Symmetry: C4
C-alpha cells in the first residue's frame, strides 16, 4: 500500500537502540508502527470485540501481593523444572503461527537462536503451522542445552500427523503440545477486514496418541476445571490453561482466573502432583508471571511479546525480551521476600477481589456533560 | 367538491381539518389521539399535509381508524403554494444530498460488512435525522438501553474441549414451529423511515429468501398493511408473527386479531410494556397517554383475548419474575422479557438479568415447560444469543440491527445480517464445545459476576489532572 | 470581567424558548454559560473534590426498578401530604442562600411566584440567609394555597433568632427546618478561587426550641440513622436526610443510601409513623424522586435545579421546572404500574447492587496506549 | 599535585578514576555500589564530574563512605574543556529558561494556593525533568502509587450532628512527644533537586517556623548532612526523626545511629521495604542490588539494633499484618504501613487497606496498645488523614506534597502546606462532629465498600464507537 516508504524509513534506523527498550510493551509499540497491515492484523488480533484478549491481561490486576519483609534476598533463584527438563527461567516462548510475516528473513529460526544465544535458555514451542520446517528450526538452535517442544495441530488426514509426530521425536523435540481449542480458527476480524486442524478431536484420539509416542503430551487450550481433571484421568503430562490468546471464543474467562479455581480442586482430589498446569495469555510483566507461579502454574507462556520482539529485532530482540522479563521476575522476587520458585506459594497473594470483574452502569451523559470540577492554580500571564 | 380557503380556514388545534391526497378530513377528534403525539398534525393542520402522511402510513389506516363521518369530500385541486407540506425531516437542511452521496454506492459492497455494528455505523451516517433519532433513541437519558447489552458482558463462558464439534445444528422450535435459527426480528414501527420504497416488505423478503429463514414479528404501527408484508413473503415456509397493542375501542382490536389470523400469522405478541409513550428526548429535541394503546389493559383483558383467538398469545414487555409467573398462571403461550428496547421506563433492568432470575424460579415452581420465555434488547453478537439460550430462553430478538441493515441495504442487507449472526452463533457453538441448541445448558456459563452492576465513586479530577502516565519508547525521529 | 458582553448577548435572546427546555439539566447548562463567575461558583460548588456532591446523584443509579405490567394506569395521582398540609407533587423547592446572584431583580420572591403561579403548588423553603426579607418573600406568594417553610440557621445571639421564629410564625410560615449540618460552612473551593450560624447547636437547644413554638420542627442535615433515631426520641416532626448539597463534609454518604438503611430500622423500632423523613441532593429526574419515595421519604427536595431555572427564566423558569419534574414523576408511575404515592412501596425496586460503590484499580496506561481495537466499515472515497 | 591526562586516562568502567572539586578519587570499587546505579558515574568517569556531584550530595559523604586510600591527591588545576561536566539534567534543552520564567514570580502568590494539588501542578511545570521524573515516579507502570490514594476513596463518613464542635483540638502524641498536628513529613532523598539552595534545610525551617510545627523525618540519602538540617531547625520545640537504611558494612550504620542520637533526633525509622531498588521507568526513560542498602537484613538484625540504641525504632515499609505482629513481638516502638510511595514492588496493596485489616487483629491479639502504627502513601486531603486516624493509625505521613511545596515555594511553601492541611483537618473534624483525635474512632466511618477494588471487563469499543449521547439545549447562536 505505498506505506512501505514510511515503514522502512521508521524501521531503518529510527528504531531505538535495543538497549533502550524498557519493557515488553515497547516492542509492541514498535512492531505496530512498522509491520505490514497484513502481519500486525494477523499478530495483534483477537476473536471480535476482543474482550477475553484484554481480559486475560487485566485479570492479573484483580490480584495483589502481600510481600514479606526482612527476609534475606541477596540471592534469588528463578529456575524451575518444566516437563522433565530443568529450565532457567519459569516462562517460555509459546507457539505463534507463521513467524515470517514480521521477520521474513529467518522466521522462527531467529526465535530458536534468541532463546539460546545469551545467558538464558527459554523453552521454544513450535507451531505445526510455523513458516519454517521443524528440521530448520531445531537445527537453528544455538545449544544442546536449550529445550524445544512441539505443538501439534492434528490433521484430518491422520497419517500426515502420524508421520509428523515420529519425525519430530526423531528431530529431538522434548514434548508434544496438542492444541485442542481450535476446532475451527476463531474470527479474527482485524485480518478479515484486509483479506489443517481436524474438528473431530476427542479424548480417545489423545488416548491413542499416548500409546503411539514416548514424548510427554500436554493438552494446550484447556478452559474449565472439568477438562483439567479429564486431562488427568486420561494420563497426559500437562494441561496449558489457555483460550488461545483470546483469539478463539470471545467471552472466555481469563486463564489466571481459571487457575485460581482449578488448583484447589486438584488438591482436594490430590491429583495435583500428577499434572503440570501451565497458563498463558496476557503476561506482559514479571509480576504477572509471579501471580501465575504463586497460584500453581509450573511455567507460564507468552506468544505476542516474543513475536513482536522477533519481528522488530529478530534473534537479538527475542534475547532481549528474555533478559527484560527475567529481570522483572528477579527483582520482584527480592521484593516479594522469596528466593526460589518453590517458595512462591498462594499465601504471598491477596485473592479477595479476584472476582471483582465488573461491568458498569451507563455513564450519565448529561449530568456528566454539564458538570465541571475543581481547577488547579493558574500561573501569572504577567 | 368542497372549496380550499373554507377548508384552510380550519387552521386550528382542537377544531382542526386537513387535506390528505385529495380528500378532506375533519381531524379535530383525532388530533389528541394520534400515535406519535398530536403536535405533528397540529403544526400542519388546515394545510395539505399529504407529504408527511402518504410515505409514512400503513395504507389502510384512514379507512380503518377515521370514522367515516369525519371523512369529508374532495378538495378542489390544490391547496395554494405554501399550503402543501415539505416532507418530514424535521431538522434536516439541503443535507439530503451529502447523505445521498454518502449513500451512493459509497456504501461498502455487502461482502465487506463484518458485523451488525457496521450497519449501525453506516445507517447513522446515511439516515435522515428524524429516522436516526427515531430508530436509535431510548427513553430518557438512556441507561436501560445501553445496559440491555452491557448486561451480557457480565456473563462469561466455560467451554468444553475435545468434543467433536463437526456438524453443528442451530435450529430450534419456537412456539411450535421448527425454525432455522434461534433468533427473530422484533416489531418496529415505521421501517419506511429508513427504507422508504419497501419498508417492512423488504424485511419480509430478506428473512425468507436465503437458505436460512427467520421469523418476522410485524408491528401494529408498521408503515405497511400486514396484508402486503405477508403477501411479499418470498418463501411459503417462513414464519410471521403479529404484535398487537389493544385499542381502547376493543372491537377494533377484535377486528385486528381475526383479520391477521386469516392472513395466517402464527402467533400474537401483545405488547404490554407501553401504556404511556416513553419520553425520547433526542426526538423531542429535534421537533404520552392516547386511546390507541389503551392504558387500562389488565390480566383479565388477556384472559378474554384467549377465548377470542386460536393463535398463541405471548405477552411481550414483561419486567419481573412475578409477571412471568402470573402469565404462566393465566396460561398464555409465552412471555417476552423485554423493556421495549429501553425506550419506555428508564432504569428498568436488563432482560438477561431478569431471565437469570426467573428461570430457576420457573423450574422450582414446576411451570418451566409450560411457558416459552423469549428475551430481546441489547443482542448484537452470536455469543449474546448463546448466553440468552444457555439460560433458558427459547428465542432471542432484535429490533435495531434489522432496521439499520434494512435501511442501508434493503433485503439483501437483512439477509446478510441473518447470515452474519447465524455464522457467529455456529462458530461460537463449536468453540463452546456443543452441537445442538438443546445442548446449550447453564452449566456452560460463568454467572459468578452476573450481578456486578457497579456505579463507581465520582472521582478525582485534580488527582488525575496532575497525574502523568508512563510512556512507550519513541522512534528517533517519528 | 468584560464577559458581561458575552453574557448579555447569550442571555438576551439567544436563550432557547422556555418551551424548549426538556429537563432540569438544560437549565443548568444555560445558567452555566450566562451567570456571573461569582454566582455560578457560589451556586454550583461542592466541598472540594466534590465527590459527595456527584455521589448524591449517581447513588440513584445503583437502584433499578422492577415494574408491574397490565395494571390499570389511565389515572395516576402524585399528591401527598407533607408536614400537616397536603401538597400537590412529592418534591419541594429547597432552601438556596442568596437567590439574587443570578436573579438580581426579584431574588427569592420569583421562586415564591413560580411555585404558585401555575397549576401546581410546590412547597418553598426560605433561607435564614435569603437575599430578600421573609416578609417580602411570603408576601410575593400568588396563593393562600401555596405552602412555605422556614429554615432557620440559629445565631449565636440567640435573641436574634428567637425574635425571628416568632416573626415568621406570625408571617404564617408552615414549619421550621433547623439546618444542623453547617456548624461552619464547608470549603467551596470554586468560590474561594475567585473571592450567622452558631457552632454550638446541640440536641438540648432543639428541645428548648420545641417548647418555644407551635410550628413543626424538622432537623435538616441528618446523616446517619443514629441521629434520625435521636430526632425521634426528642420529638421533632421530621428529619431531612442531607449533607447540604455535598457542600459541607466531602466523603459523606449519599442521602438515598442512608434512607435505604435508616427506614428498616425505623420499622424494627416502630417509630416510623412518628417521623417524616425527607431526602435531598442529586435529584434531577422524576425517577430519582420515585426511587426516594419508594424507599420511604415523605417528600424529596431540590436546591440547584430551581436555583438555575430561576436565575435563567425567573418565576416562569421555576414554574416550568415544576411542570417538567411533575411530568417525569407522572409518566414514570404509569410505567412503574402504580397510581398513588402510597402505592410506591420498596418492592417496586431492585436494591441488590445499592452498595456497588466501587473505586477502580489504576488504568494500565501502557497496555491501554499500545492496544487498538476493532474499526467499523469505511465508506468508499470513490 | 597529580597530573590531568594520567588521571583522564582512567576513563573506563571497572577501573574508573574521577575528579570532584580538586581532589582525585579512584572510583573503581565504588562504581557498582553507588546508590542511584553506577551508570551516572560510568558515563562521566575520567572527567571532572564536580558539576553533578557538588549540588547533589550530603556534603560529608566522600569523607564518610570513600575509604581514604581511594582519596587521591590534587589534580593540577583543571581538566581540559570538555572534561568538566554540564549539570545533571538529563534530557533538558535550553529549557531551563522557559521553566525559569514560568517560575519567575509567575508562580501564583502563596495566598492563592488552595490545596496540596496546586503545589504538584506548579512543580510539574517549573521542575527540571530529572527532578520531576525522580519525585513523581512510581515503580513500574505505577498501579500501587495511584491505588495508595484511590483506596481512601473506598471509605466514606458517618458524621454526627448537633454536637457542639466549637473548639477543635487536632494535637496528638506520636512516639511519646506531643505533636501539634496528626501528620508528619516522610523521608525523601535529594530535596536539592527541586530546592537547590537549601534542600532539606528549608523543610526543617518550614515545619518549625509557624505556630503549628510538624515532625520531620530525615532520609539517609538526603542531600544535606543531618548536622545542618537539625542545626537549621527554627524552633527548639519541633521534632526530627532519622530514617536509616542499614549498610552492608554494619559498623557504618552503627556509627550513623550514635551520631544522629547525639544530634538529638527523636526516633529511628528503619526502612525495610527497599532491599532491591524499585524500577522507575520514567527516570530510566530519561537517562537494583547495592551494598549500601544491605539486602540480607532480617528480624535478628533489628533485635541487635535495639541493644545498640536508646531511641525508639520504627520499622518503616511493612506490607502485611504478619509483619506487624512480628514487629510487635520483637518489641519495636512502631511500624509504618508503607510500600515506599509505590516506587518499590508494584501490585503492593494500599496501606489504608492494610491498616483496616490489621487493627482488629492488633486488638484481638491484645498487642494494640504496644505498637504505634503510622501509614503513608497517597494522603492528599485532610479527610484522608481522618480516615487513617479513625481506623487506628497514630500519625499519617506525606512524601511528595512536601517536596512539591518545598521545591516551588521553599520554607513558606512548606508552612503553607502545613497550614492548608491542618485547616482541612480541623474543618472536617467539625463537620464530622468530633473535637479530639481521640474522638476519631471507627464507628464514624463507612467501611462497607472498603474492599471494592474492581477491574471491570474490557469493553466494547464498537458498541460505544457508534453510540450517540443525549444532548443539552443550545443557545440560538452560540
Ligand atoms: C388520518 C389519521 C391518521 C392515522 C390513522 C395515522 C396513524 C398513525 C399511526 C398508527 C402511526 C405510527 C406512530 C409511530 O411512529 O410511533 C402514525 C405515525 C405518524 N403519523 Fe400518523 N396518522 C394519521 C394522520 C396523520 C397525519 C394527518 C399526519 C401528518 C401530520 C401524520 C403523520 C405521522 C407521522 C410523521 C408519524 C411519525 C412521527 C415521527 O416522525 O416519528 N399522521 N400515524
Ligand atoms: C564519591 C562517592 C559518592 C558518594 C558517597 C555518593 C553518594 C550518593 C548518595 C548516598 C546518593 C543519593 C541517591 C538517590 O538519589 O536515590 C547519591 C545519588 C546520586 N549521586 Fe552520588 N555519590 C558519590 C559519587 C557520585 C559521583 C562521582 C557522581 C557523579 C556522577 C554522583 C552523582 C549522583 C547523582 C546525580 C545522584 C542521583 C541520581 C538521580 O539523578 O536521580 N555521585 N550519591
Ligand atoms: C500471531 C499468533 C498466532 C498464533 N498461532 C498459534 C499456533 O500456531 N498454534 C497454537 O497453538 N497457538 C497459536 N497462538 C497462540 C499461542 O501461542 C498462545 O496462545 C499465545 O499467543 C498466548 O497469548 P499471549 O500472546 O496473549 O500471551 C498464536 C498466537 C498469536 C498471537
Ligand atoms: C424504532 C423502534 C420502534 C419500535 N416499535 C415497537 C413496536 O411497534 N412495537 C413493539 O412492541 N415494540 C417496538 N420496538 C421495540 C421492540 O421490538 C424490541 O424489543 C427491540 O427494539 C429490542 O431492542 P433492540 O432494538 O435493542 O434489540 C421498537 C423498537 C425500535 C427500536
Ligand atoms: C447555592 C446554594 C446555597 C444553599 N444555601 C443553603 C442555605 O441557605 N441553607 C440551607 O440549609 N441550605 C442551603 N443549600 C442547600 C439546600 O437547600 C439543599 O441541600 C440543596 O441544595 C440540595 O442539593 P441539590 O441542589 O443537590 O438537590 C444551598 C444550596 C446551594 C446549592
Ligand atoms: C522522591 C522520593 C524519594 C524517597 N526517598 C525515600 C527515602 O530516602 N527513604 C525512605 O525510607 N523512603 C523514601 N520515600 C518514600 C517515603 O518517604 C514515603 O513513604 C512517601 O513518599 C509516601 O508516599 P507519598 O509520597 O505518596 O506520600 C521517597 C519518596 C519519594 C517520593
Amino acid at each position: 500500500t505505498k506505506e512501505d516508504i514510511a515503514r522502512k524509513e521508521q524501521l531503518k534506523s529510527l528504531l531505538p537502540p535495543l538497549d533502550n527498550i524498557i519493557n515488553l510493551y515497547d516492542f509492541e509499540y514498535l512492531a505496530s508502527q512498522t509491520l505490514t497491515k497484513q502481519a500486525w492484523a494477523f499478530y495483534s488480533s483477537g476473536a471480535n470485540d476482543e474482550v477475553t484478549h484484554r481480559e486475560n491481561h487485566n485479570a492479573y490486576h484483580r490480584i495483589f501481593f502481600k510481600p514479606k519483609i526482612l527476609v534475606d534476598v541477596r540471592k534469588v533463584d528463578i529456575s524451575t523444572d518444566m516437563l522433565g527438563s530443568h529450565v532457567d527461567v519459569p516462562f517460555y516462548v509459546s507457539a505463534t503461527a507463521l513467524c515470517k510475516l514480521g521477520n521474513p528473513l529467518e522466521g522462527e529460526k531467529d526465535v530458536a537462536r534468541g532463546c539460546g544465544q545469551g545467558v538464558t535458555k527459554v523453552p521454544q514451542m513450535i507451531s505445526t503451522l510455523a513458516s519454517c520446517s521443524p528440521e530448520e528450526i531445531i537445527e537453528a538452535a544455538p545449544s544442546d542445552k536449550q529445550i524445544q517442544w512441539y505443538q501439534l495441530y492434528v490433521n484430518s488426514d491422520r497419517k500426515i500427523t502420524d508421520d509428523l509426530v515420529k519425525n519430530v521425536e526423531k528431530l529431538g523435540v522434548k514434548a508434544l503440545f496438542v492444541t485442542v481449542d481450535a476446532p475451527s480458527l476463531g474470527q479474527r476480524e482485524k485480518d478479515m477486514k484486509l483479506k489443517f486442524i481436524d474438528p473431530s478431536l476427542t479424548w480417545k484420539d489423545i488416548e491413542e496418541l499416548k500409546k503411539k509416542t514416548k514424548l510427554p503430551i500436554v493438552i494446550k487450550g484447556v478452559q474449565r476445571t472439568e477438562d483439567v481433571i479429564k486431562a488427568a484421568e486420561i494420563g497426559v503430562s500437562g494441561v496449558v490453561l489457555s483460550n488461545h490468546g483470546g483469539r478463539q471464543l470471545d467471552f472466555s474467562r481469563a486463564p489466571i482466573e481459571v487457575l485460581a479455581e482449578t488448583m484447589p480442586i486438584l488438591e482436594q482430589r490430590n491429583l495435583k502432583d500428577k499434572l503440570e498446569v501451565f497458563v498463558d495469555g496476557g503476561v506482559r510483566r514479571g509480576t504477572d508471571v509471579l501471580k501465575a507461579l504463586c497460584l500453581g502454574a509450573k511455567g507460564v507462556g507468552l506468544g505476542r511479546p516474543f513475536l513482536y520482539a522477533n519481528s522488530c529485532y529478530g534473534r537479538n530482540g527475542v534475547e532481549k525480551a528474555i533478559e527484560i522479563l527475567r529481570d522483572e521476575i528477579e527483582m520482584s522476587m527480592r521484593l516479594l521476600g522469596v528466593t526460589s520458585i518453590a517458595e512462591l506459594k498462594p499465601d504471598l497473594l491477596d485473592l479477595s477481589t479476584l472476582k471483582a470483574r465488573t461491568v458498569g452502569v451507563p455513564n450519565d451523559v448529561l449530568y456528566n456533560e454539564v458538570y465541571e470540577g475543581p481547577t488547579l492554580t493558574e500561573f501569572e500571564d504577567a
